[PDB]
Swiss-Prot record, chain A:
Disease: The muscle AChR is the major target antigen in the autoimmune disease myasthenia gravis. Myasthenia gravis is characterized by sporadic muscular fatigability and weakness, occurring chiefly in muscles innervated by cranial nerves, and characteristically improved by cholinesterase-inhibiting drugs. Myasthenic syndrome, congenital, 4A, slow-channel: A form of congenital myasthenic syndrome, a group of disorders characterized by failure of neuromuscular transmission, including pre-synaptic, synaptic, and post-synaptic disorders that are not of autoimmune origin. Clinical features are easy fatigability and muscle weakness affecting the axial and limb muscles (with hypotonia in early-onset forms), the ocular muscles (leading to ptosis and ophthalmoplegia), and the facial and bulbar musculature (affecting sucking and swallowing, and leading to dysphonia).
TM annotation in the entry: 11-32
Compartment(s) where it occurs, according to its Swiss-Prot or TrEMBL record: Postsynaptic cell membrane; Cell membrane
Subunit text: Pentamer of two alpha chains, and one each of the beta, delta, and gamma (in immature muscle) or epsilon (in mature muscle) chains. The muscle heteropentamer composed of alpha-1, beta-1, delta, epsilon subunits interacts with the alpha-conotoxin ImII.
Role, per record: After binding acetylcholine, the AChR responds by an extensive change in conformation that affects all subunits and leads to opening of an ion-conducting channel across the plasma membrane.
The name this protein goes by in its record: Acetylcholine receptor subunit epsilon
Species the sequence originates in: Homo sapiens (Human)
Covered residues, full protein: 297 to 346 of 493
Membrane-side (Extracellular) residue stretches: 1-10
Family: Belongs to the ligand-gated ion channel (TC 1.A.9) family. Acetylcholine receptor (TC 1.A.9.1) subfamily. Epsilon/CHRNE sub-subfamily.
Effect noted on mutating R35W: In CMS4C; shortens burst duration 2-fold by slowing the rate of channel opening and speeding the rate of ACh dissociation; has a mild fast-channel kinetic effect on the AChR by shortening the long burst and increasing the decay of the endplate current
Top-level division of the source organism's lineage: Eukaryota
UniProtKB/Swiss-Prot annotation, chain B:
Family note: Belongs to the ligand-gated ion channel (TC 1.A.9) family. Acetylcholine receptor (TC 1.A.9.1) subfamily. Alpha-1/CHRNA1 sub-subfamily.
Gene coding for it: CHRNA1
Result, substituting C31W: In CMS1A; increases the rate of channel opening and slows the rate of channel closing but has no effect on agonist binding
Span within the parent record: 408 to 456 of 457
Sequence intervals crossing the membrane: 21-41
Protein name: Acetylcholine receptor subunit alpha
Amino acid sequence: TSLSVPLLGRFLIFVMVVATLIVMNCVIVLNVSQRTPTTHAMSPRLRHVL
Amino acid sequence: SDQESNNAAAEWKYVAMVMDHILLGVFMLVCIIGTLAVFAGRLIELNQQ
Ligand SMILES: CC(C)CCC[C@@H](C)[C@H]1CC[C@H]2[C@@H]3CC=C4C[C@@H](O)CC[C@]4(C)[C@H]3CC[C@]12C
């Protein structure tokens, strides 16, 4: 039925969204970590921030 | 000789990185456009009731 979303479905969609966000986070962390001088320039602002 | 070979390899890697950035933009844009083009027509038709 479609009058409301069941708790089980809500929880599963929530954990799927959290997993997707953490996948995006891992991709971003890997992008930042594997930067090398021969391709990327040293950002000083991000370095000072982090 | 190794430094020259590594510089050529790094040129190839840079080309791959540029292609990756373009494709990231293109695929996010295509995801948005597909999501809209599939549903938005019917959704606006229903909202106009
Ligand atoms: C994407 C993340 C943030 C949320 C995942 C859970 C989803 C499925 C939840 C979050 C908020 C929820 C909605 C909140 C309130 C209502 C109004 C109610 O009268 C019918 C269900 C409905 C429409 C819910 C459906 C399920 C819902 C969309």
